[PDB]
Amino acid sequence: PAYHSSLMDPDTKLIGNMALLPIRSQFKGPAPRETKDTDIVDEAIYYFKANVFFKNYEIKNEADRTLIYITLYISECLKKLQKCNSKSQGEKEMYTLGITNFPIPGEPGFPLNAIYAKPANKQEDEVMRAYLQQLRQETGLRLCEKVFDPQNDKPSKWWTCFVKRQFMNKSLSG
Amino acid sequence: TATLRPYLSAVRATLQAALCLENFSSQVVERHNKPEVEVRSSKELLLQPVTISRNEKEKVLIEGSINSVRVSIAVKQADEIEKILCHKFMRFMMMRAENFFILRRKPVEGYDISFLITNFHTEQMYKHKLVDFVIHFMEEIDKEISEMKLSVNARARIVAEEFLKNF
Amino acid sequence: AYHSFLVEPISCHAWNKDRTQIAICPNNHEVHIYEKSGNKWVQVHELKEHNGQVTGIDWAPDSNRIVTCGTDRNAYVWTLKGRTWKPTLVILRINRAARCVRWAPNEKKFAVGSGSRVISICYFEQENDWWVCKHIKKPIRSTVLSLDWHPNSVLLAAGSCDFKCRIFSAYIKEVEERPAPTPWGSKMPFGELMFESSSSCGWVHGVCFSANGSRVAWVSHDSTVCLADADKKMAVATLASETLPLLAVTFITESSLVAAGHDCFPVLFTYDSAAGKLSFGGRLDVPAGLDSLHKNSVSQISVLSGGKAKCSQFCTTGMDGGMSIWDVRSLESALKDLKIV
Amino acid sequence: GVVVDSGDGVTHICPVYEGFSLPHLTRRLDIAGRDITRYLIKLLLLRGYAFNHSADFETVRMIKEKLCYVGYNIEQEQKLALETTVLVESYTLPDGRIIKVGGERFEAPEALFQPHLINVEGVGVAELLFNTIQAADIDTRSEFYKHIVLSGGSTMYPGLPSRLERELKQLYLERVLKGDVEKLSKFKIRIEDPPR
Amino acid sequence: ARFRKVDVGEYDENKFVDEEDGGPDEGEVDSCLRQGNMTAALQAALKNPPINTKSQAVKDRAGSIVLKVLISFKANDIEKAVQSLDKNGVDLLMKYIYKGFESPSDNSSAVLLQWHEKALAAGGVGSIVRVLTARKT
Amino acid sequence: GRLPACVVDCGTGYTKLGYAGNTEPQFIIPSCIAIKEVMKGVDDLDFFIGDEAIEKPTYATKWPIRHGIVEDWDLMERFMEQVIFKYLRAEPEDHYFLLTEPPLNTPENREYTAEIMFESFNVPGLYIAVQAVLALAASWTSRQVGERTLTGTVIDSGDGVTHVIPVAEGYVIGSCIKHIPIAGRDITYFIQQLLRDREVGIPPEQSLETAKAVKERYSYVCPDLVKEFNKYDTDGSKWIKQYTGINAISKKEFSIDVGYERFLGPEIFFHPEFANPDFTQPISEVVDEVIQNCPIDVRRPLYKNIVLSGGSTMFRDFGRRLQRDLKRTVDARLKLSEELSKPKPIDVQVITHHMQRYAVWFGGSMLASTPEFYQVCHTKKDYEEIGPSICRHNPVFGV
Amino acid sequence: MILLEVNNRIIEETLALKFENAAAGNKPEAVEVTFADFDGVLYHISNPNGDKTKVMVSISLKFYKELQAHGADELLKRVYGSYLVNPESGYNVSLLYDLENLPASKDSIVHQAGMLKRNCFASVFEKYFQFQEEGKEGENRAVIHYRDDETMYVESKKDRVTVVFSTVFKDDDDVVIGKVFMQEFKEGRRASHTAPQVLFSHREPPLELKTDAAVGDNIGYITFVLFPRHTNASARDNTINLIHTFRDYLHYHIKCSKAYIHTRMRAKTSDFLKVLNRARP
């Protein structure tokens, strides 16, 4: 069955009921600094091709909620990366996409509002909004070195072919 | 034929007189309910058997009782092919007696096909339509046997011609 | 006026005193009680105790007690307590299915015809607080199909598969007392055979006593209707019908009878005392593919109002699951040629 | 008096005297409810319905209780099963499938009277009942013959008290009256088989 | 396993036993027939039927006489004859007609079906019902 | 006698026919018959069956054979005419016949079959075997077995639906059968979608063609999805294959790459939700559910003898993956027990052998080759003296 | 399918497959097939001594000795030449195909191999057809017991060749149906005036054989009268192809006739049940 994260720690912090997991990134945000050689973003990208076919997903940890968000986002990236001609150009659209304000738990337009806890206050709100953006940014740029072949203008069909199945039948653009 | 209608008319009238049944609990066995014309363990519950004949070969035997009637028919069989066609057809239907619920699985000795109609049948079905059915049945098995006869002969000629024409 | 309670047979029926409720057995182990609400019929009770099909039901008017008998060899007297009917087991001491049951006019006893070739006369002993029964055996040789009490509550008419219509004395001195003489006889000891028809043909489906009880009529499977006149030395008038067998019969006046059966419609018969002759006087059902109200054999007929002396309305139930209510005056209006007496 | 008792485990014909019962003259039958359910399973298998002895035991038990009965004259019952379809009844299985059951309705219980049918030695509930009363006291034989009573689930088969009655008539006429038809008439038999 | 061979029911005192105890003028019927008086022959053949004899020989005899008359009849003269009988006669005729259906020979059933038709018109289905429930026939 | 019995196994999309004793069927033909559409003369003989019936212009194609709705007996009977006289070329009066019925087929259908066989074709003897039971007998050929047994769990997967059938002592435990809405066709469709979203130059009217071919030539079952996906994304030159077909219109060549679909197709057996929105139970779970529904006393034996039957169980490592996954579910269950409270470990074995594709026909061919087969068959003499009812029951044999 | 085919599909498809793979250069797969044909014929296709590069097709006829007395060996050799080898134990004729030495036209030999049974029968007819053409009258008639209880008699006369079949109808009612077909054969010249004349005798052999010819209620004799236009060098093969399939052609059609009657009975019974159920409220 579907692939779950093994990164939940007894000392892992939470932002809502999502796991505030560490990441290796230069982008700004409340994400802890990761020291190990792999982080939640790499994990989501590693499991994507398989996980994306699944229709059902059991939430075992608050780490899964984070894993799920990134999985859904990878789909959003592929939607944009689908129509582009160059590794350079693709990086720009990803910067833009990462900055755009996507819906968060509690808002209509965010699927899984029955599984994600909405921000309790304005601080928690802005902090979650920051983490999500930081995850989007790192996911996006990291995805580019994967989607494009050393042969420019090549949004690999091996990544493009998923542009339209929807993990758990949901969408962030929906 | 100058004697078909008169025959069926007599059979129909007798069936109307015979099909006047009612629910009857066994007088011989505690908590049993059996078709009296079949078990015949109580002579007073049995009616006089009667026969209606069209000729020396065609006839219908009707045996009534308080809760059931047994109707046996001797079908028209002019020659050998009609004899075997009738035998195969009656056997065919009797093998499916459970779906054809008013049919006996075996004919009364001396007849080609037999019906066993009980009060339970006259209760869930219009008894006048059951009478209609038996008459309809007698008329239709004759027509089907004739059609089968024509069929075999028809295919036989094409089969003989197909082989012979190829020499 | 026809009403369909179901599509399966109504095995038997019984009306309460005021004719406001009808008890019917739907080809079941149960008895359903209906009542009218406006011009609609509504089921108000479900009597479930028998472990076999109910074949007979009778309702005692004043005491308001219902008695039922079934193929399970049992008989139950039902008493209404509040909003529910409760049964009391009555042992008939028979080893075959019960076939019919009727309360006596005085409501002190009830008789049950059975396949044990006997009639069980039951009564309650307020001494031991239970129901007991005595058998009327000789000379019944077959299943008893029908029963009807004489107004004196002693004489009892019975019809059986041995082709006979008999009148017995069901005299039980411990619940009633010495009955006054009757043209049927002066000596009425328990089980005494007062009368026995002289035919050896046709099961006797139904019997009925006239309002005064000096006359008894019955219909047999040989398509005949008979009437024994106790005032003419029990002379028997017979009438052979040109149609199918009658299953039920009742007097509507001292000289008029209404019967029904396999033809599926009620017919009228009249008795000419002077000539001692029975006469057919008409189809009373004047307008699947049938021209009658009932679409299958009519198995029971009962007087609803006017009694057997001057019946004004009567009821018929049949194997079609329907129940009809007939109005005698309406019938006389629609049929200018109608007799009645 | 004798109280032929039979359950889902075993059968018993216990003779009792004024007070009480008497072990001597008390016999057990090696055939009961479960054995009949098992035989029914075998019979249905021959009809083309392969019910598993364990997985479907309760289903076949329910089929037995609803449709099974005791034949009065096996010769006549078999004719009804072979020549007509009046014995065939439809029964809906738990998974929705509807099966048709006929002759097996009276065949299964017949084991009670013909033990060999299920590979059991004995003489059958009836012959057994007869031997128990025939060997007993002479001053109670008559009384016993109309104080035989039943109890236990495996005795509510329609026609059981009747089949027993007929089987005893046959035994008494042959092993007591020598065959003197003209004296059986006055051999009183009465099977008590009450309502509760 | 013998004892079940005997049908003890045949000796059951609680059974049912019919009441039993112990024909037309042949020469008379012949007289009418030879003279062409068919209706007369019919009414004579229907006299004193052996409703009580045990032997099938005497019954089979009366049936022959009656059947002899029905066969000798002209198709168009059947209705009239049938209508000359009273209800009891019609009922008895119907019994003999069904009797005849059991011994077919050279269109014998052909004319008998004509008799059944007319007899039925006169006595109704009830006359047939009484052929069925007769214990003495 | 000197002549071998006829063995006919009728599928839903394939009838396997041949003579007993042979290892493979002499013919494997589509279970379809083409007719013209008041018959007169010899119109009834104007038909074709198998491949010869799939593409005939003036004829309408029928498949009188399915799990779903009712047997057309007229067409089944005609179908048999050519099976006997055209393909097998056997004088029916000289050969005993072994036919197969699905499990849960009714006694009535068995009498209908006998009526055709004895009264139309005059066969001397007939035996109707239940498919699942023959499949078990077929496994006796396996190196993994040492004792003959007719107790096991049969996984029959053709092109329509997959069946999980428990068998005890030669008789199917009818009340415990379970069906799965995943079979060959579903795998084909899924592979079809995968290609539609990635490859170009594929003639629409030839969409299925490519998919079925890709499945039959390149599909298999993998141990793990992510690890497999990673494999392909790294050493693509030795995992990605190419297929080339010809455009029925224009006669030119089109070449496509074959990837993920190789392992994603057969994967839907284990992860139905991938392609089926109404069914999500993994085949391993269905098998477990079935066996647990069976008598406790017969369970372990069922876990020990799980057999495969059908072309859809032919994927490389189908059995291995089933065995693994099933062992995980069952071992996990016994884990909870101990913790809560030492149940002996349950031995789970999925048997795979070389005669799987036509395990039913092979089992029938091996059994009809033995003397015992002739002992248990119902003869025409008994059919005549006793009746078609004798064909309601067919005694198991061979062990 | 009205006329039965002459070739054996199992022989042809088996060989075809082996020849295609051989020509393709693939390694040969083992083959072991045992099957039958009408008239108690038994075949066997195998690799002699396990050599997968050699495929043998063998046929077994219980009455081969009788065909041999009428030129079978000679005809077979003329047809199969070097493909014919010493017969496998248990069989009368064996063909051997070397996959490493196949002809240019592999389809042509597959066709003749499929006719093995037909070619075994051929000689007896060609022999007597020749007799007729040469005017050699008085020659003893050929007696071929093609079935355990069935015989075929061939006799040549001045202007015609007669083929008589003594067939058995195991099913009593099949005799009745068969008579219907035979009558149409007897009247066949009313549709094809040049076709062979056919005679039929039930329960009794033609007088010329009133010998140890079988007699019985289930026996039937059919006589075909072949004329020069049917027996000459130009019509010979086609005529043989037909006549040797007659017995099985007749029985095949009797059975198909019964199947058709079954469809009639399913329809009429089905309708009866509908009427019956309309009798319910």
Ligand SMILES: O=C1CS[C@@H](c2cccc(Br)c2)N1c1cc(Cl)ccc1O
């Ligand atoms: O119901 C049965 C019993 S055995 C089997 C069958 C196979 C081959 C020919 C036939 Br006559 C019947 N058969 C069957 C019938 C239909 Cl109509 C469709 C599929 C079957 O397997």
